[PDB]
Structure 1
Amino acid sequence: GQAFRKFLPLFDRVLVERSAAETVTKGGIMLPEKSQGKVLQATVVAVGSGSKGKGGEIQPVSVKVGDKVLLPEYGGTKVVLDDKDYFLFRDGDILGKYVD
């Protein structure tokens, strides 16, 4: 498993950074902050070693650092590193990967 800025998740976790906020629209209009929720597309920056539950050998995380992913809506913990909000999910919870 791989780390981040003086941080390393444990056993299953994945530390992500939510992507841009989408402040303006596509055509030409522009948006406030109370709307617009939390962006669900994110990039993975840290990855835990591997699943502890896997009998004998650890089962390593599948999402590798540097990927874009489609996050779930709810499951997730807020962590603050260098005053930047990063979110710590569990490997099973990550919905999709934006491969391209």
Structure 2
Amino acid sequence: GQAFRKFLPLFDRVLVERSAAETVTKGGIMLPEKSQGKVLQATVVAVGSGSKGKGGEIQPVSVKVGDKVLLPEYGGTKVVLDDKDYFLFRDGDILGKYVD
């Protein structure tokens, strides 16, 4: 697998970083800090080894580090690295992958 900040997920778990929230509209209107909610855009930083649930051999994670992905609304777990916040998700929960 690929490590990050001395952290390595186990099995197919994927660690992602949520993008910075939006605080100014397209005009000049600022937003309250309590209304932005939770942003569903994140980037992949660490990747696990493979899929344990597959019979026999174990499949590798389908997303590659550096990709931008759209997270679901309810899943995820909180992990603290250097007092920063990162979120850990399973491979199957990642909805879609942004391309360039």
Bin for the TM-score computed over the shorter chain:
over 0.9
User: Shift of the alpha carbon at 1:60?
Assistant: 0.3
The answer for unaligned runs of 5 or more in structure 1 is none
Alpha-carbon distance in structure 1 between the residues aligned to 2:90 and 2:37 = 21
| CA deviation string 1:36-84 (max 9, x = no partner) | 1111000000000000111222100001110100010110000000111
| CA deviation string 1:8-49 (max 9, x = no partner) | 111010000000111111122111111011110000000000
Q: How many residues align?
A: 100
Q: In structure 2, what is the equivalent of residue 53 of structure 1?
A: 53
More strand by share: 1
Percent of aligned positions that are identical: 100
Alpha-carbon distance in structure 2 between the residues aligned to 1:3 and 1:39 = 25
TM-score of the superposed pair, with normalisation by structure 2? 0.96
The answer for unaligned runs of 5 or more in structure 2 is none
Alpha-carbon distance in structure 1 between the residues aligned to 2:60 and 2:27 = 43
SS in 1 for 2:92: helix
